[PDB]
């Protein structure tokens, strides 16, 4: 019934800048201050930063500052580092023994534009014995996240047979890496010759293409 509303869902700020994450509850929390803040990275349990709306947790740095009372709460992260690129949650405790997590806010570290390094991988001969061929296009070390990958099989634009994977933002150089996997059957793979991956990014003035011919490696 009751809501815990976390805004914004995404926010970007450079190293040394500041972010503000707000949590608004539909009903006042227990004792007007039972509100916590968490930091979570990929594959890890969340780490407590603030409890009781403003008390700093043991081991969290001083640059994490919480404030608020009642229904309106704010986490302020000043003096941003690349380590802080994570998803942050608020957690309110309520009368009736009820805990409600916030929706989450993704903090992205803003940096300079980096164009992606593109590599293409032909399918292995071991995979071709099993009747499936996967062609892999890698986009390495780029910022911002927004890029577009197009597959061309004998100059024909593919649709419906590719999937992408994006890493989390890097904790050192704040870049992303992306892989796109083109899945074809073995009979469809051996009917065609040219396999091209065309990559479009805001740091590239023109779309870059890396390609190979089947059997001509």
């Amino acid at each position: 019934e009751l809501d815990m509303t976390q805004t914004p869902s995404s926010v970007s700020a450079p190293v040394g800048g500041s972010v503000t994450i707000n949590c608004q509850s539909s009903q006042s929390v227990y004792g007007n201050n039972y509100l916590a803040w968490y930091q979570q990275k990929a594959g890890q349990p969340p780490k407590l930063l603030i409890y009781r709306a403003s008390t700093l947790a043991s081991g969290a740095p001083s640059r994490f500052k919480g404030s608020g009372s009642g229904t309106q709460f704010t986490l302020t992260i000043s003096d941003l580092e690349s380590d802080d690129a994570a998803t942050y949650y608020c957690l309110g405790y309520y009368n009736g023994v009820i805990n409600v997590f916030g929706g989450g806010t993704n903090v992205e570290i803003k940096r300079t534009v980096g164009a992606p390094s593109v590599f293409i991988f032909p399918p292995s001969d071991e995979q071709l014995k099993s009747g499936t061929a996967s062609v892999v296009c890698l986009l390495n070390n780029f910022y911002p996240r927004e890029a577009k990958v197009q597959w061309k099989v004998d100059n024909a634009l593919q649709s419906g047979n590719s999937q992408e994977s994006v890493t989390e933002q890097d904790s050192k150089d704040s870049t992303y890496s992306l892989s796109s996997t083109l899945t074809l059957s073995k009979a469809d793979y051996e009917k065609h010759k040219v396999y091209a991956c065309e990559v479009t990014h805001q740091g590239l003035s023109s779309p870059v293409t890396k390609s190979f011919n089947r059997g001509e490696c």
């Binding site: 979570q40 969340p46 407590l48 957690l91 405790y93 805990n99 997590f101 999937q163 190979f212 001509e216």
Partner: protein
Amino acid sequence: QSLEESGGRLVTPGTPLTLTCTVSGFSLSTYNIHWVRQAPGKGLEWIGVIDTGGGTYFASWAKGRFAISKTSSTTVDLKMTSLTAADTATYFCAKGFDYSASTNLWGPGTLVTISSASTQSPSVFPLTRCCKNIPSNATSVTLGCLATGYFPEPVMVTWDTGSLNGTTMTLPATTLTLSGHYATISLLTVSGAWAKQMFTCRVAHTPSSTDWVDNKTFSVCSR
């Protein structure tokens, strides 16, 4: 002082499932135990809490499907019924000071998959570029391993680089659209004498068996 979850596995919908939070360091006659889950790519979600006296309080959406029980002085069980695919999540337990879920001591989490698919072992294939498309004066090279067609999560890829120093990078898993199985790409970037060096990726898949290991040994160029 730590917590660790166990019992997360792949089950069909409708199968009962019991997880176990094993605590070391603190006492359950002093501290409570929370249960928090998290769907893949989604946020944290509170389930319930057991106090020192044994009383359990849950969320509004639980609707009696979840039950928490103290089984020994170090173990706390979470029993789940009426499981569907929406319960596929990583389940954490946490040491609670009070009834609030504000705590700094969490388990690493165990992964629960609710599906009607079969436990399948990954197929590991090497990823090398066209050797004519690799420059002859290249000081570094990027190679990789494709572990595809496995279910459920996770796989673990480690690398043997020999005498060379390399940086590894594993991408998040993608759900294959036709089969529902997962696929990952682990990449290795080495510098130095990579032309004559043999490289091995070691792909482990604990849902198949605890010692399921695939070692794919290959070179950059098949000269």
